[PDB]
Amino acid sequence: EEEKQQILHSEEFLSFFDHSTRIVERALSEQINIFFDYSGRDLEDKEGEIQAGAKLSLNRQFFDERWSKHRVVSCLDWSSQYPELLVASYNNNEDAPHEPDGVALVWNMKYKKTTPEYVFHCQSAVMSATFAKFHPNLVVGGTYSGQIVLWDNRSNKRTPVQRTPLSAAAHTHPVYCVNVVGTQNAHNLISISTDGKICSWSLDMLSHPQDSMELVHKQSKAVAVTSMSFPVGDVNNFVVGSEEGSVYTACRHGSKAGISEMFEGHQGPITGIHCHAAVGAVDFSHLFVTSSFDWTVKLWSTKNNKPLYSFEDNAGYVYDVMWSPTHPALFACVDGMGRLDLWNLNNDTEVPTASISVEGNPALNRVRWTHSGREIAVGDSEGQIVIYDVGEQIAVPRNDEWARFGRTLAEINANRADAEEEAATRIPA
């Protein structure tokens, strides 16, 4: 009776019941049927349709209602320690204003259940959301105000465990970007605010950031950090974009620690940009790509303030874009129309290899592919989740495709040389 209610409300006992329900879901996910036919007699019609678009295959849809309504996919991160886990940063629940402004959700690759394994609920909108690179059971993200919160995936309390300082000296602007950076021994909880507050924080200390720096360049014009990325192994080097459509390299160390380069080719605020995420038999650290709100995607290079190349096929302002993690040619994109634009340049350059805008224009805003890149989570703001699997014939890059990728890059250099020569000669006297 009352003792049963107390035992249900008992913290250790309720936690045991929660772990019990977790293992119950694990077993019910392992609960396969007994009348199966694994010989593949039901895949011939699929094989009859495999030769016409098997490169794209949505896997599941982590859609809910407990926190999904009026909560876009604000950010996405696949857990490094457990690649079978993905996050779902929620927007401010306007429809559930009784509910708070941020409740994290777990899109699960380990299992297919609408119930998330981990949730971080807090009263601020989760702008950034970074998973723990060097830790197994930690969660942290960026408030709409900007004060970074803390949570744990293994724990049983969705509240913000710790909160970063909130002050003029602290993140007054919204935390646009944040990631788990630094070495395993020498880490750095790097975060970026809207005003330009480069916030390298500490996992231990939620009061003093390891390195806090408001950013400004071009005669100290204020830095609206729009596009964010950084170089692998170059903790100093980082990628910066502007709502005024200005790109720049970011320096963490050095006398000019801050906006290092200065690039501008876009015609919109820097919407989607990820580093060249594929590493193979060619080192292409000197190049990247970017997209804005001008229905176009601009490739970039380290020495080229002018954009490298243009993927302008969008019929509307882009939202997100990401180079593939394994295939150098491939690069996926997103927009408010669900513009899944996986484009393998070695495969298909003039058109994308897989250009799939969502029917009904689902709002694909923030996304993260698989650690191997085999699947990419894509989601509408209302919560229409799509994790498209990748056809390995298109997914797996060739061994020479990095040497051939350098070849295609030199071909692009020659074609852009032709274009630039046309630009030089086209000026009349």
Binding site: D313, A315, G316, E350, V351
Partner: protein, 49 residues
């Protein structure tokens, strides 16, 4: 986009003395593509800001 791909294929055809004739032939297709693009732009404009 297909017309743009065709124009990109034919952009190097200045040396061949058939660019003008091809343009005179395909002006109708270009006008149709332009009409479709204008319809799309009008639909976007009719999308209320």
């Amino acid at each position: 986009n297909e017309m743009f791909r065709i124009f990109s294929r034919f952009n190097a055809l200045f040396v061949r003395p058939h660019i003008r004739g091809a343009i005179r032939e395909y002006q109708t297709q270009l006008i149709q593509r332009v009409k479709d693009d204008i319809e799309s732009l009008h639909d976007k404009f009719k999308v209320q800001y």
